[PDB]
Amino acid sequence: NLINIDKPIKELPASIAIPKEKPLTGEQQKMYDEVLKHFSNPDLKVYTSEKNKSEDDLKPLEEEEKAWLTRECFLRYLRATKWVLKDCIDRITMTLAWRREFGISHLGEEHGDKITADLVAVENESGKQVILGYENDARPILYLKPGRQNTKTSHRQVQHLVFMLERVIDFMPAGQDSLALLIDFKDYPDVPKGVGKEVLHILQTHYPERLGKALLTNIPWLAWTFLKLIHPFIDPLTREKLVFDEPFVKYVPKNELDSLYGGDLKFKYNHDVYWPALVETAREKRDHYFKRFQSFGGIVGLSEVDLRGTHEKLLYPVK
Amino acid sequence: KNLINIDKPIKELPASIAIPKEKPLTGEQQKMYDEVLKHFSNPDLKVYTSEKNKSEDDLKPLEEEEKAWLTRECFLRYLRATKWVLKDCIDRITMTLAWRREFGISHLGEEHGDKITADLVAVENESGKQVILGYENDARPILYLKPGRQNTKTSHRQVQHLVFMLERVIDFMPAGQDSLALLIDFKDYPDVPKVVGKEVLHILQTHYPERLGKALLTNIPWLAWTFLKLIHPFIDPLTREKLVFDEPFVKYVPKNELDSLYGGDLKFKYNHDVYWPALVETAREKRDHYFKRFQSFGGIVGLSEVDLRGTHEKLLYPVKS
């Protein structure tokens, strides 16, 4: 039953359906239109930095930034800000600024991103993070294996994290915009061997509505006890995202899941095979996305369903 | 400099720490309190002899020591924890009585026949991984937990030890207070020689309602810290408020009531042959007083811990009868 695999799975298989989008209410539609109008302003200028935000340094949206400002981008921020228009606009604006500051505002090193595959590659050499497979709801899977840590604490560790989040996002199927994390806390002895605050700020400020599901395994009994103690007091919606003490096959198809966790995929991390495959696959996805964006006028507010798809006519025409 | 050398628990709340005032009950809360009281004052009442082996065919009346545990404040702890739902309150109190029987702590002390004795669990404390010491700003007694000082293998005795110390910190409550403060230090202590989870969870979530007044956390591993910070915005405000981290502990505890390791004035070194007998004796003396007071006031269900733990001659909370 085992399937030997050493590279990311490039497409969502036909056997996993795309879940239907939660419908907008009439009023939600009206403030969506307000966010679109704000960011479609041809004269709009936004900050060039978050940590060094200055009212004296503002620059218009580049082509690649317009491609990031999608229908679904607006919706992620609208949901995250509980549909408060000013908070939504302010949040999108500060993420645009942070993406500039951080070196990822260009949708790929091929458009000038300072954060490159070469810069962060060494961080993945022990396979502490792996993009592989899709779950029941068509979310791409990112494995985090902190016990396979291979490098000293540094800001390159943060850059590596953001790079992979950006790549797992590249892997979203048309019609899905959240990911699933699979976190294995087991220590791996076979692997030899400020940042915390920065990682926290990025995760809570600049990736709204990305966490679809977090599957936790090999939790140390003490942390587990504290998790269980706190669990009844977590809000129901956040509560539902966390999975522990359950078979991962309840949430992931067997042929999409590492065999270490009950699945059918026999995966061994081989850097010189996996890494070029990941980088190339994501690059191909970006190229397609950006080519679609240009073919549809290169405007703000296009849908990721259209940008990541191949249909000739738009599913979500703008205005 | 201003360090105070101490090696034993502090026996009394100092006069410099005020006892927080108790918020009055509404007329409706009073009526339902009276209902709980009526239920447990029933002379014919019989209760399960076990929780894990609960059986409708094995029920026994309340012993004298159990009546002494069924205080006004016990009722109130359960009423608050059950969100003032009477049936849930009565059911929960009942199952804790059963569990206390099963576990070996139904008698308010080894001196009344408890299977859980100081001797049984003493070895679990030899490295000082748990310490009862001092009182915080709201007069809560302080229990230090130092998981990095673990000195024993995983076993049911570790659970017994945990319960024993919770019961002791409860013995240390000042009259007028019934919650404790936990101070948890996650640092690894190498110089303590390197050498169930479900049971501990069940006990903490089922049989100690409304005991956690404050949890002060320190030396948290950065990864666990990150997960704590990520989940924090989604924890209900009431529980959120109980947790303190990345704050000076002197904000929550007087300096002369706090271990110097955490910014306090108390230079504490754990010395088992000094600390342990002092703890045991102090708690014992507190139990003796409480139970003597209970007997002096008729030995009935529903007496107030403020009265049982005090010395005033006349009852502040006479029982409705």
XYZ file of C-alpha atoms in Angstrom:
640
model
C 0.000 0.000 0.000
C 3.009 2.313 0.492
C 3.855 4.849 -2.212
C 7.441 6.038 -2.460
C 7.588 9.785 -2.987
C 10.318 12.411 -2.732
C 8.866 15.573 -4.294
C 5.842 17.796 -3.680
C 2.563 16.789 -5.257
C 1.982 19.418 -7.915
C -1.776 19.377 -8.258
C -4.877 18.755 -6.197
C -6.175 15.375 -7.348
C -9.657 15.186 -8.854
C -10.706 12.998 -5.901
C -10.725 15.970 -3.520
C -13.495 18.511 -4.062
C -13.073 22.247 -3.579
C -15.332 23.269 -0.694
C -18.057 25.779 -1.558
C -17.244 29.351 -0.567
C -19.135 30.806 2.386
C -21.632 33.165 0.708
C -21.435 36.910 1.241
C -24.434 38.687 2.748
C -25.775 41.780 0.991
C -24.086 44.133 3.468
C -20.763 42.285 3.336
C -20.865 42.735 -0.446
C -21.269 46.484 -0.013
C -18.213 46.917 2.165
C -16.206 44.576 -0.066
C -16.909 47.096 -2.828
C -15.517 49.812 -0.544
C -12.204 47.970 -0.019
C -11.926 47.400 -3.777
C -12.556 51.073 -4.491
C -9.896 52.104 -1.990
C -7.172 49.948 -3.525
C -8.189 50.612 -7.136
C -7.444 54.325 -6.732
C -4.801 55.045 -9.405
C -3.228 57.742 -7.217
C -2.939 55.529 -4.129
C 0.417 55.543 -2.349
C 1.316 53.339 0.596
C 4.207 53.066 3.064
C 7.501 51.480 2.003
C 8.076 49.944 5.432
C 6.206 48.753 8.520
C 8.941 49.003 11.167
C 10.140 52.305 9.613
C 6.757 53.552 8.469
C 7.021 57.242 7.533
C 4.445 59.652 6.171
C 7.335 61.028 4.084
C 7.991 57.790 2.219
C 5.067 56.460 0.200
C 5.091 54.743 -3.189
C 2.297 53.685 -5.588
C 1.363 50.037 -6.097
C 3.616 48.088 -8.428
C 2.201 45.614 -10.949
C 3.066 42.645 -8.698
C 1.366 44.280 -5.730
C -1.849 44.698 -7.704
C -1.644 40.951 -8.433
C -1.481 40.217 -4.685
C -4.461 42.495 -3.991
C -7.112 39.946 -4.977
C -10.797 39.448 -4.219
C -9.869 36.734 -1.773
C -7.094 38.833 -0.236
C -9.734 41.480 0.555
C -12.017 38.816 1.987
C -9.336 37.335 4.237
C -8.698 40.766 5.734
C -12.437 41.559 5.982
C -13.123 38.330 7.905
C -10.012 38.795 10.084
C -11.045 42.326 11.028
C -14.638 41.223 11.736
C -15.865 43.395 8.879
C -14.675 46.743 10.229
C -13.805 48.719 7.091
C -11.134 51.007 8.509
C -9.323 48.132 10.260
C -9.472 46.117 7.040
C -7.950 48.880 4.916
C -5.312 49.712 7.551
C -4.307 46.044 7.909
C -3.957 45.460 4.153
C -1.905 48.638 3.880
C 0.517 47.628 6.682
C 0.977 44.129 5.193
C 1.812 45.760 1.824
C 4.376 47.822 3.725
C 5.806 44.822 5.585
C 6.077 42.755 2.390
C 8.140 45.634 0.938
C 10.387 45.891 4.012
C 10.816 42.116 4.290
C 11.842 41.449 0.685
C 8.782 39.663 -0.727
C 6.737 42.418 -2.392
C 7.421 41.270 -5.963
C 5.776 37.835 -6.078
C 9.039 35.988 -6.625
C 12.795 36.427 -6.856
C 12.235 36.466 -10.631
C 10.656 39.912 -10.149
C 13.293 41.192 -7.710
C 12.423 39.657 -4.319
C 15.350 39.880 -1.913
C 14.145 36.668 -0.259
C 15.371 33.984 -2.646
C 15.354 30.198 -2.683
C 19.183 30.297 -2.498
C 19.181 32.509 0.595
C 16.941 30.179 2.615
C 17.755 26.754 1.103
C 20.256 25.724 3.814
C 17.488 26.115 6.412
C 15.565 23.264 4.760
C 18.484 20.849 4.366
C 17.330 18.604 7.235
C 13.715 18.716 6.044
C 12.346 20.518 9.118
C 9.620 21.911 6.886
C 7.935 20.058 4.042
C 5.163 21.010 1.629
C 3.440 17.765 0.584
C -0.110 16.715 -0.210
C -3.588 18.137 0.252
C -6.167 17.490 3.001
C -9.909 16.666 2.949
C -10.822 20.290 2.287
C -8.217 20.715 -0.513
C -5.816 22.659 1.714
C -2.142 22.194 0.833
C -0.209 20.572 3.715
C 2.846 22.119 5.376
C 4.724 19.872 7.832
C 6.602 21.527 10.678
C 9.145 19.271 12.418
C 10.921 21.455 14.996
C 12.864 18.455 16.309
C 14.734 18.442 12.992
C 16.191 21.914 13.661
C 19.512 22.249 11.845
C 20.565 25.884 12.223
C 21.424 28.498 14.852
C 18.813 31.094 15.847
C 19.004 33.918 13.287
C 16.817 36.183 11.156
C 17.424 33.746 8.225
C 15.192 31.302 10.156
C 12.350 33.855 9.951
C 13.046 34.438 6.239
C 12.932 30.676 5.699
C 9.566 30.427 7.512
C 8.046 33.235 5.440
C 9.472 31.726 2.237
C 7.782 28.398 2.851
C 4.460 30.012 3.866
C 4.705 31.884 0.580
C 5.404 28.610 -1.269
C 2.554 26.724 0.384
C 0.369 29.629 -0.714
C 1.705 29.143 -4.259
C 0.394 25.565 -3.971
C -3.210 26.504 -3.236
C -5.725 24.884 -5.607
C -7.974 27.344 -7.416
C -10.857 27.813 -4.988
C -8.965 27.386 -1.714
C -6.859 29.929 0.214
C -6.157 28.284 3.590
C -3.509 25.734 4.444
C -3.224 22.905 6.917
C -0.246 22.637 9.278
C 0.953 19.244 10.487
C 3.206 19.752 13.471
C 5.308 16.875 14.772
C 6.963 17.760 18.082
C 9.044 14.564 18.247
C 12.765 15.106 18.710
C 14.916 13.738 15.886
C 18.381 12.695 17.179
C 19.380 11.592 13.661
C 19.566 15.321 12.956
C 22.727 16.823 14.528
C 22.477 19.755 17.029
C 13.739 38.376 19.318
C 13.222 35.839 16.573
C 10.270 34.506 18.560
C 8.720 37.960 18.765
C 9.295 38.633 15.063
C 7.736 35.325 14.023
C 4.772 36.045 16.266
C 4.200 39.519 14.832
C 4.321 38.199 11.255
C 1.931 35.324 11.938
C -0.631 37.467 13.794
C -0.471 40.517 11.571
C 0.345 39.534 7.993
C -1.282 36.113 7.274
C -4.984 36.513 8.214
C -7.303 33.568 7.649
C -4.584 31.256 6.367
C -4.787 28.634 9.098
C -7.445 26.189 8.045
C -6.363 23.307 10.247
C -3.503 22.503 12.626
C -2.805 18.813 13.187
C -0.647 18.224 16.260
C 1.198 15.007 17.083
C 3.837 13.708 19.496
C 2.994 16.427 21.995
C 5.168 16.274 25.176
C 2.863 15.170 27.997
C 3.290 18.372 30.039
C 2.510 20.790 27.187
C -0.348 18.418 26.364
C -1.735 18.752 29.886
C -1.609 22.541 29.605
C -3.231 22.382 26.172
C -6.026 20.240 27.604
C -6.433 22.583 30.593
C -6.740 25.632 28.352
C -8.806 23.970 25.599
C -12.301 24.475 27.116
C -11.636 28.217 27.209
C -10.587 28.645 23.568
C -13.252 30.172 21.324
C -15.259 27.524 19.375
C -14.022 28.665 15.946
C -10.329 28.504 16.872
C -11.019 25.310 18.836
C -12.339 23.615 15.681
C -9.074 24.269 13.815
C -6.969 22.246 16.262
C -6.754 18.471 15.933
C -4.960 16.243 18.425
C -5.429 12.721 19.853
C -7.161 11.778 16.600
C -6.135 9.705 13.564
C -4.849 12.132 10.923
C -6.581 10.014 8.259
C -9.878 11.443 9.536
C -8.725 14.766 8.118
C -6.328 13.782 5.311
C -6.766 11.151 2.573
C -4.402 8.202 3.097
C -2.728 8.782 -0.273
C -2.028 12.408 0.713
C -0.516 11.713 4.146
C 2.996 10.815 5.316
C 3.067 7.147 6.401
C 4.712 8.206 9.663
C 1.283 9.550 10.675
C -0.888 6.715 9.386
C -0.836 7.591 5.701
C 0.257 5.772 2.526
C 3.072 8.155 1.531
C 6.541 6.801 2.257
C 8.482 10.070 2.288
C 12.169 10.526 2.931
C 13.553 14.062 2.705
C 16.306 14.259 0.105
C 17.370 17.868 -0.255
C 18.939 17.640 -3.732
C 15.726 16.078 -5.034
C 12.983 17.771 -3.020
C 14.244 21.361 -2.976
C 14.690 21.984 -6.720
C 11.294 20.316 -7.306
C 9.556 22.572 -4.789
C 11.171 25.733 -6.097
C 10.382 24.864 -9.714
C 6.769 23.807 -9.035
C 6.037 26.993 -7.100
C 7.769 29.078 -9.783
C 5.605 27.535 -12.495
C 2.489 28.290 -10.399
C 3.572 31.928 -9.938
C 4.313 32.350 -13.647
C 0.847 31.101 -14.543
C -0.847 33.260 -11.896
C 1.000 36.369 -13.050
C 0.416 35.664 -16.760
C -3.316 35.304 -16.051
C -3.270 38.541 -14.061
C -1.726 40.401 -17.027
C -4.140 38.790 -19.529
C -7.072 40.136 -17.509
C -5.920 43.748 -17.533
C -3.517 43.685 -14.594
C -6.072 45.261 -12.259
C -6.687 45.077 -8.515
C -9.502 42.806 -7.326
C -9.167 39.822 -9.643
C -10.134 36.456 -8.159
C -7.543 33.822 -7.255
C -10.002 31.273 -8.669
C -9.522 32.920 -12.044
C -5.798 33.606 -11.636
C -5.012 30.007 -10.676
C -7.465 28.515 -13.173
C -7.409 27.971 -16.949
C -10.971 28.847 -17.983
C -11.062 31.497 -20.688
C -13.840 33.696 -19.244
C -13.654 35.180 -15.719
C -15.707 33.580 -12.961
C -15.445 36.810 -10.938
C -15.225 39.839 -13.237
C -14.317 43.030 -11.366
C -16.275 46.183 -10.546
C 20.983 43.154 50.703
C 17.318 43.136 51.732
C 17.381 39.346 51.408
C 15.573 37.279 54.014
C 16.809 33.738 54.605
C 13.913 31.323 54.905
C 13.662 27.539 54.801
C 10.119 26.751 56.004
C 6.591 27.734 54.952
C 5.202 31.007 56.253
C 2.517 29.930 58.687
C 0.193 32.945 58.679
C -0.998 35.658 56.328
C 0.697 38.848 57.544
C -1.479 41.738 58.688
C -0.122 43.807 55.785
C -2.185 41.823 53.265
C -5.916 42.512 53.366
C -8.497 39.803 52.784
C -10.543 40.642 49.667
C -14.217 41.409 50.310
C -16.784 38.813 49.254
C -19.351 40.003 46.701
C -22.895 39.501 48.049
C -25.254 36.941 46.559
C -28.387 37.974 44.684
C -31.736 36.849 46.037
C -31.850 34.180 43.334
C -28.337 32.893 44.087
C -29.308 32.753 47.753
C -32.356 30.622 47.037
C -30.278 28.175 45.048
C -27.534 28.168 47.675
C -30.230 27.220 50.194
C -31.211 24.398 47.871
C -27.672 22.942 47.835
C -27.539 23.277 51.621
C -30.874 21.494 52.044
C -29.692 18.663 49.802
C -26.482 17.974 51.721
C -28.042 18.537 55.165
C -30.448 15.667 54.606
C -29.705 13.228 57.445
C -30.702 10.288 55.226
C -28.489 11.295 52.284
C -26.207 8.584 50.933
C -23.430 9.130 48.426
C -21.317 6.890 46.123
C -18.192 5.265 47.604
C -16.231 5.650 44.363
C -16.091 7.710 41.171
C -14.315 5.248 38.859
C -16.345 2.382 40.402
C -19.553 4.322 41.041
C -22.435 1.940 41.770
C -26.046 2.578 42.755
C -25.602 -0.515 44.966
C -22.884 1.037 47.125
C -23.905 4.274 48.835
C -22.824 5.459 52.307
C -23.876 8.430 54.469
C -21.647 11.440 55.109
C -18.977 10.964 57.756
C -18.215 13.734 60.270
C -15.091 14.794 58.314
C -17.085 14.973 55.065
C -19.610 17.325 56.662
C -16.639 19.485 57.649
C -15.576 19.657 53.960
C -19.103 20.588 52.815
C -18.827 24.231 53.811
C -20.591 27.380 52.659
C -17.618 28.231 50.454
C -17.418 24.697 49.026
C -21.022 25.064 47.884
C -20.169 28.456 46.411
C -17.099 27.193 44.564
C -19.222 24.540 42.864
C -22.148 26.897 42.201
C -19.806 29.374 40.467
C -18.012 26.633 38.521
C -21.319 25.207 37.277
C -22.602 28.644 36.233
C -25.317 28.453 38.887
C -26.991 25.351 37.464
C -28.349 23.506 40.522
C -28.442 19.987 39.130
C -24.885 20.250 37.810
C -23.725 21.733 41.122
C -25.242 18.933 43.196
C -23.979 16.266 40.793
C -20.438 17.700 40.783
C -20.216 17.974 44.585
C -21.484 14.415 44.832
C -18.870 12.991 42.427
C -16.044 14.851 44.220
C -17.160 13.301 47.533
C -17.022 9.915 45.781
C -13.613 10.601 44.266
C -12.174 11.834 47.569
C -13.305 8.501 49.071
C -11.809 6.425 46.239
C -8.527 8.382 46.198
C -7.871 8.158 49.953
C -8.461 11.755 51.110
C -12.051 11.707 52.417
C -11.092 12.044 56.079
C -9.396 15.484 56.230
C -6.051 14.041 57.217
C -4.086 10.879 57.814
C -4.898 11.461 61.505
C -8.519 10.579 60.683
C -7.625 7.605 58.476
C -6.579 9.016 55.066
C -4.714 6.482 52.941
C -2.786 9.377 51.413
C -0.170 10.180 54.058
C 2.798 12.501 54.280
C 5.090 9.438 54.498
C 3.658 7.965 51.303
C 4.390 11.035 49.186
C 7.362 12.656 50.957
C 10.008 11.183 48.619
C 8.281 12.927 45.697
C 9.205 16.258 47.297
C 12.853 15.479 48.127
C 14.175 17.721 45.332
C 11.728 20.526 46.118
C 9.857 20.347 42.802
C 6.864 21.688 44.638
C 6.975 24.344 47.365
C 4.271 26.016 49.449
C 5.580 29.454 50.473
C 4.172 32.952 50.904
C 0.939 34.737 50.033
C 0.181 37.024 47.077
C -1.483 40.451 46.765
C -4.985 39.013 47.195
C -3.993 36.796 50.168
C -3.815 33.629 48.037
C -1.317 31.073 49.355
C 1.472 30.366 46.840
C 2.358 26.971 45.442
C 5.535 26.837 43.347
C 5.706 24.192 40.622
C 9.193 23.433 39.285
C 8.809 20.646 36.684
C 12.522 20.977 35.899
C 13.276 19.566 39.365
C 11.594 16.213 38.674
C 13.185 13.515 40.815
C 10.995 10.448 40.254
C 9.752 8.074 37.566
C 6.233 8.397 36.181
C 3.815 6.723 38.559
C 0.469 6.997 40.325
C 2.436 8.197 43.393
C 3.246 11.399 41.514
C -0.498 12.018 41.196
C -0.939 11.317 44.914
C 1.850 13.762 45.699
C 0.228 16.475 43.541
C -3.114 15.999 45.261
C -1.460 15.983 48.702
C 0.209 19.342 48.107
C -3.010 20.912 46.655
C -4.719 19.729 49.821
C -1.902 21.256 51.914
C -1.953 24.591 50.115
C -5.695 24.563 50.810
C -4.899 23.984 54.491
C -2.838 27.203 54.260
C -5.697 29.412 53.090
C -6.272 32.473 55.278
C -9.797 32.794 56.642
C -11.652 34.713 53.960
C -9.798 33.305 50.941
C -10.262 29.997 49.092
C -8.225 30.281 45.864
C -4.497 29.764 45.454
C -1.810 31.220 43.236
C 0.433 28.935 41.216
C 3.937 30.028 40.308
C 5.314 27.779 37.580
C 8.995 27.849 36.655
C 9.748 25.838 33.505
C 13.553 26.088 33.719
C 15.501 22.829 33.587
C 17.574 22.209 36.711
C 20.511 19.973 35.715
C 21.794 19.677 39.288
C 18.689 17.692 40.102
C 19.718 14.204 38.922
C 17.773 13.080 35.857
C 15.960 9.878 36.774
C -1.025 9.583 34.484
C -1.390 12.747 32.429
C -5.020 11.837 31.889
C -5.596 11.148 35.577
C -4.097 14.483 36.628
C -6.213 16.310 34.046
C -9.424 14.668 35.217
C -8.670 15.589 38.831
C -7.786 19.193 38.073
C -10.785 19.733 35.798
C -13.367 17.932 37.902
C -12.516 18.042 41.609
C -10.914 21.462 42.348
C -13.396 24.068 41.006
C -12.574 27.733 41.517
C -9.196 27.101 43.165
C -6.996 28.708 40.517
C -6.778 32.363 41.458
C -3.619 33.228 39.519
C -1.052 31.345 37.499
C 2.296 33.123 37.239
C 4.480 31.605 34.510
C 8.199 32.102 34.015
C 11.129 30.673 32.034
C 8.794 29.525 29.271
C 10.559 27.768 26.334
C 10.361 30.073 23.311
C 8.440 27.604 21.148
C 5.780 26.894 23.791
C 5.755 30.654 24.417
C 5.029 31.283 20.747
C 2.100 28.847 20.861
C 0.868 30.420 24.097
C 0.999 33.871 22.480
C -0.751 32.604 19.330
C -3.636 31.054 21.272
C -3.893 33.872 23.884
C -6.222 36.196 21.911
C -8.756 33.370 21.738
C -8.866 32.463 25.438
C -11.978 33.738 27.229
C -11.301 36.994 29.148
C -12.005 35.506 32.609
C -9.399 32.741 32.209
C -7.084 35.086 30.315
C -6.948 37.354 33.376
C -5.672 34.533 35.608
C -2.543 34.000 33.515
C 0.496 36.181 34.092
C 3.611 36.004 31.928
C 6.285 38.471 30.744
C 5.427 40.663 33.744
C 7.382 41.339 36.974
C 6.002 39.000 39.657
C 6.315 41.779 42.269
C 3.328 43.330 40.536
C 1.284 40.398 41.873
C 3.121 39.369 45.063
C 4.715 41.443 47.837
C 8.530 41.374 47.666
C 8.795 39.836 51.149
C 6.422 37.055 50.069
C 8.263 36.164 46.862
C 11.260 33.929 46.155
C 14.317 36.048 45.236
C 14.849 33.981 42.081
C 11.788 35.745 40.640
C 12.533 39.252 41.897
C 11.463 38.767 45.512
C 13.189 39.254 48.871
C 12.964 35.639 50.048
C 16.253 33.777 49.705
C 14.847 30.232 49.745
C 16.841 27.030 49.560
C 14.952 23.759 49.645
C 16.161 21.543 52.470
C 13.933 18.512 52.740
C 14.709 17.544 56.353
C 13.807 21.076 57.425
C 11.056 22.133 55.026
C 9.000 18.914 54.902
C 8.394 18.341 58.625
C 7.554 22.047 58.995
C 5.011 21.928 56.178
C 3.385 18.762 57.495
C 3.162 20.050 61.065
C 1.895 23.517 60.075
C -0.830 22.047 57.860
C -1.707 19.522 60.578
C -2.112 22.276 63.154
C -4.370 24.190 60.730
C -6.503 21.055 60.183
C -6.786 20.402 63.917
C -8.046 23.948 64.504
C -10.509 23.822 61.595
C -11.965 20.503 62.736
C -12.091 21.538 66.401
C -14.008 24.672 65.334
C -16.317 22.533 63.188
C -17.131 20.317 66.174
C -17.601 23.340 68.482
C -20.278 24.714 66.159
C -22.381 21.550 66.078
C -20.603 19.541 63.390
C -23.137 20.455 60.731
C -22.961 20.854 56.959
C -22.795 24.411 55.637
C -20.510 26.136 58.135
C -18.304 28.919 56.763
C -14.555 28.484 56.305
C -14.215 32.073 57.567
C -15.563 30.824 60.881
C -13.773 27.461 60.858
C -10.394 29.051 60.140
C -10.823 31.980 62.552
C -10.822 32.433 66.349
C -13.776 34.804 66.890
C -16.257 33.375 69.398
C -19.517 34.141 67.580
C -20.317 32.853 64.054
C -20.139 35.306 61.165
C -22.196 32.934 59.026
C -24.729 31.030 61.125
C -26.391 28.226 59.187
C -30.040 28.572 58.095
C -32.139 26.080 60.043
